[PDB]
């Protein structure tokens, strides 16, 4: 026979190897596939889909339909934001439970950009202006309206549209501190006539084109 020489690695099974293997059923009638719609190539595609962030995880509001209903309540102009959110997509309970976030449990590194979308869940007759803010990493949560307003902010008029979208720029993982996303009463809620003074809002985060991942890990029990 041809002179051959056995090197280290022979007879050892690599869990994530790439070798050719002998087939148990030669010539089997493999049913060919059909164009069932729902063909995916990657996981990130699933992450560039909007997902209702369950902001409210209070004692009762955690694990019931209210976890998604961030009420615009009758209080004063107390500048401590209507909503607060820490940009730790996997290291933050509200973001770790998202479609995007679940995928972020399957890697150690994620990098790129994300986007927040808000649905105003109030009357056509109701109006007002709110403010969406993002202070990139380093900066702390901006405690007063002004502080957030000073930086990247979006003034969103209710009485003009129900759809608000503010994209988040550059970030990176190792699953320890990132950015923050916040909502503020720019103005306040204008109620027309005798209309329920406490309506809600719905937030949807989704990844950006530039968002991808690296180093595959897990967790199961």
């Amino acid at each position: 026979g041809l002179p051959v020489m056995n090197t280290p690695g022979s007879n050892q099974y690599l869990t994530a190897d790439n070798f050719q293997s002998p087939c148990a059923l030669p010539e089997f009638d493999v049913t060919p596939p059909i164009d069932i719609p729902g063909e995916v190539k990657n996981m990130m595609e699933l992450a560039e889909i909007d997902t209702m962030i369950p902001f409210d995880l209070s004692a009762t509001k955690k694990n019931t339909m209210e976890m998604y209903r961030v009420r615009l309540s009758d209080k004063p102009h107390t500048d401590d934001p209507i909503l607060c959110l820490s940009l730790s997509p996997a290291s933050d309970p509200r973001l770790s439970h998202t479609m995007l976030g679940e995928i972020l449990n399957y890697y150690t590194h994620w990098a790129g950009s994300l986007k927040f979308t808000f649905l105003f869940c109030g009357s056509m007759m109701a109006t007002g202006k709110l403010l969406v803010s993002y202070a990139p990493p380093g900066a702390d949560p901006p405690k007063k309206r002004k502080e957030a307003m000073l930086g990247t902010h979006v003034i969103w008029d209710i009485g003009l549209q129900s759809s608000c979208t503010m994209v988040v720029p550059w970030i990176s993982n190792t699953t320890t501190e990132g950015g923050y996303i916040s909502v503020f009463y720019q103005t306040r809620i204008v109620v027309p006539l005798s209309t329920p003074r406490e309506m809600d809002i719905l937030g949807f985060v989704s990844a950006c084109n530039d968002f991808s991942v690296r180093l595959l890990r897990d967790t199961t029990h």
């Epitope: 902001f55 409210d56 995880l57 209070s58 509001k61 955690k62 961030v70 009420r71 309540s73 209080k75 107390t78 401590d80 934001p81 209507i82 909503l83 607060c84 959110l85 820490s86 933050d92 309970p93 509200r94 702390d140 949560p141 320890t176 923050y180």
Partner: nanobody
Framework: QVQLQESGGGSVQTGGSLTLSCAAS????????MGWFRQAPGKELEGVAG????????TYADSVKGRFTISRDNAKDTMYLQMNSPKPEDTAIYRC???????????????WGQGTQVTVSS
Amino acid sequence: QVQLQESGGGSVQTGGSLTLSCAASGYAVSLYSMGWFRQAPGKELEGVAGISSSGVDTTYADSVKGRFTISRDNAKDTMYLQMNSPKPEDTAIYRCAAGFGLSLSRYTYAHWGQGTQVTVSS
């Protein structure tokens, strides 16, 4: 992870001074700000008190300012909710975990503790 464990609650003669605690079973106890939410039977868990990230700010609800007190222990994790002079409405279920804010539970520090029922009986 910081997992919060609530202590300090129960019955008191209306007009006492109940100090309520909440141990942080995690490193970043120095995390964010802090707070105490109360919820009446079937009613919402409104933001009562709050302290800062360091343990410096003092933020209270309209009812509770002047009497209620909050103080997070840096060294020994737990924040102290001292309900100076508790009243009939202070007969609510108390919760903790409010780092990054006050006012509403519609935000703050999501990972919330269980619960302790305070019954102001005079």
